[PDB]
Design a protein around this ligand. Sequence first.
Ligand SMILES: C[C@@H]1CN(C(=O)N2C[C@H](CO)C[C@H](C(=O)Nc3ccc(Cl)c(F)c3)C2)C[C@H](C)N1C
Ligand SMILES: *[C@@H]1O[C@H](CO)[C@@H](O)[C@H](O)[C@H]1NC(C)=O
Ligand SMILES: *[C@@H]1O[C@H](CO)[C@@H](O)[C@H](O)[C@H]1NC(C)=O
Ligand SMILES: *[C@@H]1O[C@H](CO)[C@@H](O)[C@H](O)[C@H]1NC(C)=O
Ligand SMILES: *[C@@H]1O[C@H](CO)[C@@H](O)[C@H](O)[C@H]1NC(C)=O
Ligand SMILES: *[C@@H]1O[C@H](CO)[C@@H](O)[C@H](O)[C@H]1NC(C)=O
Ligand SMILES: *[C@@H]1O[C@H](CO)[C@@H](O)[C@H](O)[C@H]1NC(C)=O
Ligand SMILES: *[C@@H]1O[C@H](CO)[C@@H](O)[C@H](O)[C@H]1NC(C)=O
Ligand SMILES: *[C@@H]1O[C@H](CO)[C@@H](O)[C@H](O)[C@H]1NC(C)=O
Ligand SMILES: *[C@@H]1O[C@H](CO)[C@@H](O)[C@H](O)[C@H]1NC(C)=O
Ligand SMILES: *[C@@H]1O[C@H](CO)[C@@H](O)[C@H](O)[C@H]1NC(C)=O
Ligand SMILES: *[C@@H]1O[C@H](CO)[C@@H](O)[C@H](O)[C@H]1NC(C)=O
Ligand SMILES: *[C@@H]1O[C@H](CO)[C@@H](O)[C@H](O)[C@H]1NC(C)=O
Ligand SMILES: *[C@@H]1O[C@H](CO)[C@@H](O)[C@H](O)[C@H]1NC(C)=O
Ligand SMILES: [Cl-]
Ligand SMILES: [Cl-]
Ligand SMILES: [Cl-]
Length: 341
Amino acid sequence: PVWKDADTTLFCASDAKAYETEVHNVWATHACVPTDPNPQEIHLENVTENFNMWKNNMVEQMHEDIISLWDQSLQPCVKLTGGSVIKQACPKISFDPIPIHYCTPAGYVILKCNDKNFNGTGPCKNVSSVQCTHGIKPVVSTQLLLNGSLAEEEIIIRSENLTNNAKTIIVHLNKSVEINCTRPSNDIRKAYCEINGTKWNKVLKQVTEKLKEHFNNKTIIFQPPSGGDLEITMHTFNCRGEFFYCNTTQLFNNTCIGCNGTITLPCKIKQIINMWQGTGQAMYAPPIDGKINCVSNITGILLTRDGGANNTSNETFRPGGGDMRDNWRSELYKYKVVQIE
Ligand SMILES: C[C@@H]1CN(C(=O)N2C[C@H](CO)C[C@H](C(=O)Nc3ccc(Cl)c(F)c3)C2)C[C@H](C)N1C
Ligand SMILES: *[C@@H]1O[C@H](CO)[C@@H](O)[C@H](O)[C@H]1NC(C)=O
Ligand SMILES: *[C@@H]1O[C@H](CO)[C@@H](O)[C@H](O)[C@H]1NC(C)=O
Ligand SMILES: *[C@@H]1O[C@H](CO)[C@@H](O)[C@H](O)[C@H]1NC(C)=O
Ligand SMILES: *[C@@H]1O[C@H](CO)[C@@H](O)[C@H](O)[C@H]1NC(C)=O
Ligand SMILES: *[C@@H]1O[C@H](CO)[C@@H](O)[C@H](O)[C@H]1NC(C)=O
Ligand SMILES: *[C@@H]1O[C@H](CO)[C@@H](O)[C@H](O)[C@H]1NC(C)=O
Ligand SMILES: *[C@@H]1O[C@H](CO)[C@@H](O)[C@H](O)[C@H]1NC(C)=O
Ligand SMILES: *[C@@H]1O[C@H](CO)[C@@H](O)[C@H](O)[C@H]1NC(C)=O
Ligand SMILES: *[C@@H]1O[C@H](CO)[C@@H](O)[C@H](O)[C@H]1NC(C)=O
Ligand SMILES: *[C@@H]1O[C@H](CO)[C@@H](O)[C@H](O)[C@H]1NC(C)=O
Ligand SMILES: *[C@@H]1O[C@H](CO)[C@@H](O)[C@H](O)[C@H]1NC(C)=O
Ligand SMILES: *[C@@H]1O[C@H](CO)[C@@H](O)[C@H](O)[C@H]1NC(C)=O
Ligand SMILES: *[C@@H]1O[C@H](CO)[C@@H](O)[C@H](O)[C@H]1NC(C)=O
Ligand SMILES: [Cl-]
Ligand SMILES: [Cl-]
Ligand SMILES: [Cl-]
């Protein structure tokens, strides 16, 4: 037994099939080990550990991994960084995120919180020790968290500090909503996403009811973002190498709270991108021919609540995003690196 909170350089593991030209497979082929063929978490009886997803170095180390992965894979034709114009080739590559694991070196270990209602902050009773995390797809996106895990029971909200309106709110759905996005073949940048309105409006109600429990039964309002750049104002994600920008006004505004068809969101495949890894912009080539389709699971929402509403009866929320660290936080919340003393 015995341990103390600390961090160390982690290493990764994946099922990266060799020869596969998919850029996540080739990055994990040369940078990760094959996953443990025989894991085993030694359950710790009557233990109580304190976690903190918002102050966790694991998400920082995962962040630099995805920065590096994206930095070797999808290379932009022209990168406008720091005021420079570093040009390149931009071969249309194969893109499809693979689950990645994070495993302690000898001398350290990860603790996993098995409390089904754990919100990512503070005490946890059902603690267990693991050598690796689990298969985590590094899906880069804003507004909506796609292709992740779901809450095991009720809807969990996650925030470093709910009263602080500047701290991001992560909503962990206990049930996914299918997002189906397509770019029909022969405007080649014209695309759309289909969401079944009955599913979405239902879980959006459950979210608003759970959100009500954490704001003194205040009226909960869902409005679209208060301006900014397109990466924040629209649900942005990457599908088969193409950067999709989808207008989600029909989701935080169609407050059907004669409306339960299939919501069709408008989308544009953008070339000039505002990077998430930092710095500035990236210019990619026009989309590949053929039908560009990706069907993903909506498993989380990145929310931000308006400030000066203390003296009112409403709490308005808008979809957030931009810091991919919160995206990794959405799956690494239950994990925590401890060194054995
Ligand atoms: C977390 C921030 C990142 N950052 C920014 O400047 N921006 C501003 C930019 C527009 O304002 C949008 C950036 C974004 O999230 N882009 C994006 C790109 C592709 C896809 Cl697929 C996606 F889902 C999102 C966020 C720099 C800084 C080092 N970091 C703190
Ligand atoms: C604690 O979590 C583990 C993980 O599956 C499992 O044994 C069970 O859900 C919990 N144990 C108890 C005794 O409740
Ligand atoms: C989407 O969600 C369903 C049910 O929640 C699940 O069975 C399925 O495996 C998920 N798909 C992916 C790609 O994770
Ligand atoms: C999800 O959690 C909500 C609580 O906000 C609950 O009302 C609902 O029944 C749950 N649904 C599932 C499928 O777990
Ligand atoms: C998270 O859970 C802890 C312990 O149950 C509680 O003290 C804290 O207020 C919760 N935070 C949020 C944002 O729900
Ligand atoms: C009122 O606003 C301040 C910031 O201006 C914030 O610190 C405080 O938490 C708010 N009141 C409540 C009850 O949250
Ligand atoms: C949470 O936010 C409020 C509002 O600014 C602040 O007064 C309070 O100190 C914060 N809590 C912590 C633990 O920092
Ligand atoms: C996704 O949309 C395309 C185009 O509308 C359609 O052909 C396909 O059947 C849809 N799939 C799902 C699972 O909704
Ligand atoms: C919110 O409203 C419900 C009514 O369904 C009530 O039972 C509950 O106590 C209220 N919560 C708070 C924190 O006032
Ligand atoms: C999204 O579409 C609505 C119309 O439904 C429009 O008013 C809004 O400006 C669009 N969003 C952006 C960021 O342009
Ligand atoms: C949706 O929000 C936009 C502002 O972004 C506004 O044009 C429109 O009136 C809203 N829709 C509804 C039904 O209120
Ligand atoms: C709308 O929902 C009702 C049940 O609430 C269902 O019977 C009806 O078929 C739905 N409408 C459409 C067009 O699917
Ligand atoms: C949406 O999903 C619900 C299941 O929650 C289903 O009953 C309904 O028929 C779906 N509507 C459409 C238009 O696909
Ligand atoms: C989500 O997973 C599905 C199935 O693996 C895949 O087709 C889709 O492209 C993924 N979505 C994103 C945004 O990576
Ligand atoms: Cl191993
Ligand atoms: Cl060019
Ligand atoms: Cl309103």
